[PDB]
Design a protein around this ligand. Structure first.
Ligand SMILES: *C(=O)[C@@H]([C@@H]1NC(C(=O)O)=C(S[C@@H]2CN[C@H](C(=O)N(C)C)C2)[C@@H]1C)[C@@H](C)O
Length: 244
């Protein structure tokens, strides 16, 4: 009974109140809905940053460069964040968004196979350039919020061109929240070495009844913003719309 004008206003205000510019795309069935305080971002290209980890893991697992219980050892070198200084599975690394593990996995895949697989699944502008272990951070790979939500929709419904088992193993890594019999699966992203900086949270909601509603939030991150503003705007938006 809440008007769409009111939903649009409330979700715009969540971005306004985080002092950022952003959009959140929701897809119900085949219909895309765009909300937020910067709608024109929906079809603009940004680096995928750590959202690329979902496809890196699909490619690595499909091509047997890793398994889901293999432990990627910390090599003992200092990492940007102390929580990355430990040994972890692809799964743990997904939740911590640990770039060093994903960089190692990309190097096992190698530049040639990586290029072929990123073209094969049709991700973003599909260009990875000549450096297998940084193309998702500063270019040249870019992707729009519409393309990210369509990727999430594909993964949520096992539609990507990988085995069903590869897709389920990656999906199991992405569970971030359970809210009233609803499950939220998502990957966050924060591209710090592009200007302006870009924040992402892309995934889907699995409702109690089995329906999956994919989303993609995309915003401008600014110095001394907390990463958790991405989750908060998302949960508020999905709750406002009655998806969770
Ligand atoms: C991916 O985009 C980069 C990493 N991704 C994230 C993220 O999406 O939050 C971070 S932030 C890093 C992870 N956990 C630490 C933390 O204190 N929290 C935000 C919970 C800091 C990285 C920048 C990746 C390419 O570096």
């Amino acid at each position: 009974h809440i008007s769409s004008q009111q939903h649009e206003k409330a979700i715009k205000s969540y971005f306004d109140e985080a002092q950022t510019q952003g959009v959140i795309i929701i897809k119900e069935g085949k219909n895309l809905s765009t909300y937020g305080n910067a709608l024109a971002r929906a079809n603009k290209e940004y680096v995928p940053a750590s959202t690329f980890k979902m496809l890196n893991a699909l490619i690595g697992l499909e091509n047997h460069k890793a398994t889901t219980n293999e432990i990627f050892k910390w090599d003992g070198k200092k990492r940007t964040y102390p929580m990355w200084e430990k040994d972890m599975t692809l799964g743990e690394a997904m939740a911590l968004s640990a770039d060093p593990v994903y960089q190692e996995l990309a190097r096992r895949t190698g530049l040639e196979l990586m290029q072929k697989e990123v073209k094969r699944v049709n991700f973003g502008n599909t260009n990875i350039g000549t450096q297998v272990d940084n193309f998702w951070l500063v270019g040249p790979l870019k992707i729009t919020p519409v393309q990210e939500v369509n990727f999430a929709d594909d993964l949520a419904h096992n539609r990507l061109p990988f085995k069903l088992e590869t897709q389920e193993e990656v999906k199991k890594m992405l569970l971030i929240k359970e809210v009233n019999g609803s499950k939220i699966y998502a990957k966050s992203g924060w591209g710090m070495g592009v200007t302006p900086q870009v924040g992402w949270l892309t995934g889907w909601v699995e409702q109690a009844n089995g329906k999956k509603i994919p989303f993609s939030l995309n915003l401008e991150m600014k110095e001394g913003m907390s990463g958790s503003i991405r989750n908060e705007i998302t949960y508020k938006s999905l709750e406002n719309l009655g998806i969770i």
